[PDB]
Amino acid sequence: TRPTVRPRNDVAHKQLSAFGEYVAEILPKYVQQVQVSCFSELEICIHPDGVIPVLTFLRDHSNAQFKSLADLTAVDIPTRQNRFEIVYNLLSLRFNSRIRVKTYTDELTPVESSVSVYKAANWYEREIWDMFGVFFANHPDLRRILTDYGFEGHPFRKDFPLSGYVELRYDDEVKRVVAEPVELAQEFRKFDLNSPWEAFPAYRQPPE
């Protein structure tokens, strides 16, 4: 208990609980889950038709400033009707608190493209388009950054395998570097390590 166990502080837990119920009171149009972890960071789980209202609210209003933007990743969870998750990760400058706006989406329907209100979101948005495929309507510039120009597939899905379909080599028949389907030298032997016996008891989902 006292040694080697990272102690939690319930003060931040209670204050973020009050702040979360406050947000769910004042924006009832879009709020679904307001969850607080044990390490006391706020997680607000949101429908993707209030991205512009929630961010235009949470940038201002003088109960929570939150100027700073960070990570946006649309973490691909299958077995859902909506695969991808846009995760905005917002930081204050006056208050020292971190909130995670997790809004959901699918492969095709656009989110509202936050670049009009957070200027940092431009290359983050271009990266999420080039790696996942979440189109951003009413956005100025969608190009490819971090992948090749002759490349397609949105490689950070789960449906894109670890090796590539294309692979380059030089050949002198045409004096240039050409693309061929993959012919590995070793298998990348993947080891089964999902060991049984339920290493955590508090997270048992309800069975049938």
Binding site: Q186, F188, R189, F191
Partner: protein, 176 residues
Amino acid sequence: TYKYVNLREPSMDMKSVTDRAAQTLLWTELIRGLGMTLSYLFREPATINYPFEKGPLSPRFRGEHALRRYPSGEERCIACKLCEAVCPAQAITIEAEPRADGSRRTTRYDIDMTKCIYCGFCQEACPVDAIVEGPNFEFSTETHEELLYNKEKLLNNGDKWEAEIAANIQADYLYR
């Protein structure tokens, strides 16, 4: 606690403005920079004449990938496959058979020296300390064929020296 920089003002006294004017029209601070660089000229440079003076090191370097063996005995490995399970680029490849005795042994033990990223995870992981990151770092190889070490390569590379390896392990078996 904050200690900000660049907050002075130009003092309009005659002394300060004629000092800044002398700085401008008389190249004084540039001569100061030349003075600092010549002050490092007349030192003695810390180079080492390389192929005669090798550099310093630690007794915990990660080099050659040797194998060991028991005192007046046979090989120390077992083929317990922990090093293939922990090799973070999976350069280790182990195919194991038992021989005519019954004690378990190997057939094939491979390191890709290309894919080896020299962690020391197979140094920490091996229970009998069979594989040791070797001491020296001189590989300098012409072809790509040579850089795929075999088990007999690693045995003849552990037979090439152990006195180094045994001295370093006895220096540093107490920490790790």
